[PDB]
Amino acid sequence: QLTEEQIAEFKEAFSLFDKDGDGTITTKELGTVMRSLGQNPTEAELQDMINEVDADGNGTIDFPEFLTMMARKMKDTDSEEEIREAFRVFDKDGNGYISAAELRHVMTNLGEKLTDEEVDEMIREADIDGDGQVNYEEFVQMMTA
Amino acid sequence: GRKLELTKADTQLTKRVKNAAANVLRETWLIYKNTKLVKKIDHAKVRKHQRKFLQAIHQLRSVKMEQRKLNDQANTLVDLAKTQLE
Numbered sequence: 252q253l254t255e256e257q258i259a260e261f262k263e264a265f266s267l268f269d270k271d272g273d274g275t276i277t278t279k280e281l282g283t284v285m286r287s288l289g290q291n292p293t294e295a296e297l298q299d300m301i302n303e304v305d306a307d308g309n310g311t312i313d314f315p316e317f318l319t320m321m322a323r324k325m326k327d328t329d330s331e332e333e334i335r336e337a338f339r340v341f342d343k344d345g346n347g348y349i350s351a352a353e354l355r356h357v358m359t360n361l362g363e364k365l366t367d368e369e370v371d372e373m374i375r376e377a378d379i380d381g382d383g384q385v386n387y388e389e390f391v392q393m394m395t396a
Numbered sequence: 397g398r399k400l401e402l403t404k405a406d407t408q409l410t411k412r413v414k415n416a417a418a419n420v421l422r423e424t425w426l427i428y429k430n431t432k433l434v435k436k437i438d439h440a441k442v443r444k445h446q447r448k449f450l451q452a453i454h455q456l457r458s459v460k461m462e463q464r465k466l467n468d469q470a471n472t473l474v475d476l477a478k479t480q481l482e
């Protein structure tokens with residue numbers, strides 16, 4: 252089931268996929284979107300993504316097939332464990348802590364990065380005890396509460 | 397809003413499942429017969445069916461992994477669509 256406001260917002264979402272704005276999502280458009288999210292689906296996987304939603308078998312996804320499909324997967328779940336696992340990547344000694352210095356080293360060099368100033372705001376919240384150490388299980392629990 | 401929450405988790409793949417699953421049944425039976433229902437174990441026969449058994453089991457593992465991959469790709473697109481709910 253979907254509400255009036257959700258149907259309207261999902262029309263806007265359909266434009267994130269229908270790149271040329273021709274009313275249909277092709278395997279080519281899904282490939283571009285997936286790669287823009289740092290994924291690399293094969294041709295068969297893109298075809299499978301279309302075929303699972305394509306109820307009339309014309310090779311593309313239209314807005315009703317897209318909407319019908321969103322209705323089936325509305326349920327969300329909390330991301331606490333996955334986020335904790337991402338911090339664990341940077342827990343060199345596997346002791347449940349990342350120092351404020353290591354957090355800066357990570358955040359100013361890896362991925363999209365934060366400025367040293369943004370790192371300061373993050374550490375001010377993360378370092379609850381003011382000991383220069385982040386108990387990341389506790390910090391993630393705080394952000395997902 | 398949704399904040400940090402995310403979506404809760406083919407004819408060719410179906411054919412890969414049915415053939416691999418039938419072969420798991422085939423080889424489980426032939427290993428069983430050749431190790432427990434014979435007077436004298438023929439080790440060459442056991443090695444042959446162990447090779448066919450591991451290939452069928454591993455083919456089913458491969459399909460299941462591909463289905464998990466396809467499911468997360470679909471959930472990625474659903475998650476992107478759900479950003480418009482904010």
Ligand SMILES: Cc1cc(C)n(-c2nccc(Nc3ccc(Cl)cc3)n2)n1
Pocket residue numbers: 268299300301303304312320466467469470471473474
């Ligand atoms: C069991 C199974 C296997 C696949 C692939 N399934 C599936 N389910 C829902 C959607 C979907 N693809 C898709 C297509 C386009 C968009 Cl924009 C978003 C999701 N695919 N389901």
Ligand SMILES: [Ca+2]
Pocket residue numbers: 268269270271272273274275276277280
């Ligand atoms: Ca299009």
Ligand SMILES: [Ca+2]
Pocket residue numbers: 305306307308309310311312313316
């Ligand atoms: Ca269609």
